[PDB]
């Protein structure tokens, strides 16, 4: 449950047990939980992103979309459980939703490799983006994964090609694609479904070309000194926006998305609607050109 430094907020949760009007001392609860979050360090942020009570793909699927039919398999090997995808409506408008599904409990986490997919997962992810296009449908993805599952079968089964083939095929997609990092944007295993027209990122989510711990123990010969790496690379929401890297930063409730998923859904569901509409004034031809263009610009050369 409750994160680390949220302790005093957790302790202040001792209100339910409770003149009789003092019940509104929680005004101070609202503060504190306000000042505590005002000065959070890079490393501290990634912890919220990885927060144990943070909403996952399916949560928003149930909180913001209706008539969601989850499609399974890649047609050739299996149905990766680290990837959730299917056809649903977004205020009537059918959409193709694809995302990393971690899992609250340690058991679900196991059943879904903590959201790290195997090559057969990206192959499924793409099959769906492809079905979207086929039926002039929009594609909405939710990124939240520690990264692509590193393993033997993964390699033996083309974890590289799988990812690559997606980066290629996604760019040529002929419909709008809004990508939101709702949690942990890990490596290219996250990028394998992050090549979109609009690329929003929630206030406390992160994104990096490698996990902090790794980068840490590689350029600092120290594991624990990961926080140092986190602030070095620039894995935080704004740190990125200041570089044309992400389009918009969707904000979370007071003290984190976990503190109120129904409001977070609101904010997000809204943002999607925004992008997914100021994008229909574009012709397929233009859309793709816009994307390709935005794609070549990434970087400084």
């Amino acid at each position: 449950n409750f994160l680390d430094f949220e302790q005093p907020i957790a302790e202040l949760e001792a209100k339910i047990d409770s003149d009789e009007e003092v019940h509104r001392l929680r005004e101070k609860s609202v503060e504190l939980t306000r000042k505590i979050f005002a000065d959070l360090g890079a490393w501290q942020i990634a912890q919220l992103a990885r927060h144990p009570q943070r909403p996952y793909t399916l949560d928003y699927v149930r909180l913001a979309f209706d008539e969601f039919d989850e499609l399974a398999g890649d047609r050739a090997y299996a149905d990766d459980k680290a990837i959730v995808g299917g056809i649903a409506r977004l205020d009537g408008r059918p959409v193709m939703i694809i995302g990393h599904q971690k899992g609250r409990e340690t058991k679900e986490k196991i059943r879904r490799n903590f959201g790290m997919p195997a090559p057969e997962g990206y192959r499924k992810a793409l099959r769906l983006m492809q079905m979207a296009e086929r039926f002039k449908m929009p594609i909405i993805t939710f990124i939240d994964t520690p990264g692509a599952y590193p393993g033997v079968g993964a390699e033996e089964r083309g974890q590289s090609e799988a990812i690559a083939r997606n980066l290629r095929e996604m760019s040529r997609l002929g419909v709008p694609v809004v990508c939101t990092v709702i949690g942990e944007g890990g490596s290219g295993g996250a990028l394998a479904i992050g090549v979109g027209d609009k690329v929003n990122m929630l206030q406390y989510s992160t994104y990096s070309v490698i996990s902090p711990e790794g980068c840490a123990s590689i350029l600092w010969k120290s594991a624990d000194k990961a926080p140092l790496a986190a602030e070095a690379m620039g894995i935080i929401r704004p740190r990125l926006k200041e570089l044309k890297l992400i389009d918009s930063i969707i904000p979370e409730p007071l003290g984190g998305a976990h503190r109120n998923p129904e409001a977070m859904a609101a904010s997000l569901k809204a943002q999607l609607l925004a992008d997914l509409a100021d994008l229909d004034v574009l012709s397929t031809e233009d859309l793709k050109n816009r994307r390709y263009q935005r794609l070549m610009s990434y970087g400084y050369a």
């Binding site: 692509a148 590193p150 393993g151 033997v152 993964a154 390699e155 033996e156 089964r157 083309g158 974890q159 590289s160 090609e161 990812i163 690559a164 083939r165 980066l167 290629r168 095929e169 996604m170 760019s171 040529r172 490596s187 290219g188 990028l191 992050g194 090549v195 994104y207 990096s208 070309v209 490698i210 790794g214 980068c215 590689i218 350029l219 600092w220 070095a232 690379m233 620039g234 894995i235 990125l240 570089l243 890297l245 390709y292 794609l295 070549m296 990434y298 970087g299 400084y300 050369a301």
Partner: protein, 257 residues
């Protein structure tokens, strides 16, 4: 000038590892082969015209060391080196990684330069070949490095709908980011003998399943049997072979050996 072999020890005269293209004549073991040299050993004579040379990096994040770790031991801008030219009188673009440069790490310049090769090969309307050697993306440029994957791969897409043959040559080693991007999106994926190719390094991979990694795991010979590679061509033969294949894909007349 008498160098020793990596895995064999057979002393060898430098001038020898020349017409034998940095390859062990007694062990056939392929060795470190310069990025600018490779391009030479491929493209014909004189035809070499460098592209994207007017491209140099810069630290935009103020990383640890960075500006200092970033040119005296390679006399090059970035890990990749694009070069226009010809193969047996055939117009063809090329590009190769300098694994000496930090690890042939992909980042900004690497991606830009690559894109060039594609842009060049696109209007010229000619084949593209890329020799790959890297250990991942340049962490020093963070998400900028990452994005390169999506870009280089996005361009390769134009290349393909155009009908132009792109051959990726994976050389020991090609891992992570590049491995999982344009380095695996070739029309023909060709690996040099006993190469080490994969997405995750054996290192991390190992300390995961916490066991023994299968024999050969991630070597040209292993991969070719998991169908990730079209074929495994030796270096000396590489030149003509590339021309041979490419020649057929392009409908042009077979090169004159």
């Amino acid at each position: 000038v008498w160098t020793k072999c990596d895995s064999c020890g057979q002393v060898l005269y430098r001038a020898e590892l020349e017409r034998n293209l940095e390859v062990c004549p007694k062990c056939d073991h392929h060795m470190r082969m310069t990025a600018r040299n490779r391009l030479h050993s491929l493209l014909d004579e004189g035809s070499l015209v460098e592209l994207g040379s007017e491209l140099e990096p810069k630290d935009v994040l103020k990383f640890r060391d960075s500006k200092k770790y970033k040119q005296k031991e390679t006399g090059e801008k970035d890990a990749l080196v694009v070069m226009k030219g010809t193969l047996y009188g055939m117009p063809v673009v090329a590009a190769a990684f300098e694994f000496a440069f930090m690890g042939g790490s992909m980042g900004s310049v690497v991606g830009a330069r690559f894109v060039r090769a594609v842009e060049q090969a696109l209007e010229d309307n000619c084949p593209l070949i890329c020799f790959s050697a890297s250990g991942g993306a340049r962490m020093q440029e963070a998400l900028m490095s990452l994005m390169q994957m999506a870009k280089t791969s996005a361009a390769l897409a134009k290349m393909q709908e155009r009908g132009l043959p792109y051959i990726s040559v994976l050389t020991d080693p090609t891992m992570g980011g590049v491995s999982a991007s344009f380095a695996m999106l070739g029309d023909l994926n060709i690996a040099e003998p006993k190469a080490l190719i994969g997405f995750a390094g054996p290192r991390v991979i190992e300390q995961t399943v916490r066991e023994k990694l299968p024999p050969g795991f991630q070597r040209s010979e292993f991969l070719i049997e998991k169908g990730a590679i079209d074929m495994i061509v030796r270096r000396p033969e590489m030149r003509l072979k590339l021309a041979s294949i490419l020649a057929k894909l392009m409908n042009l007349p077979a090169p004159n050996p």
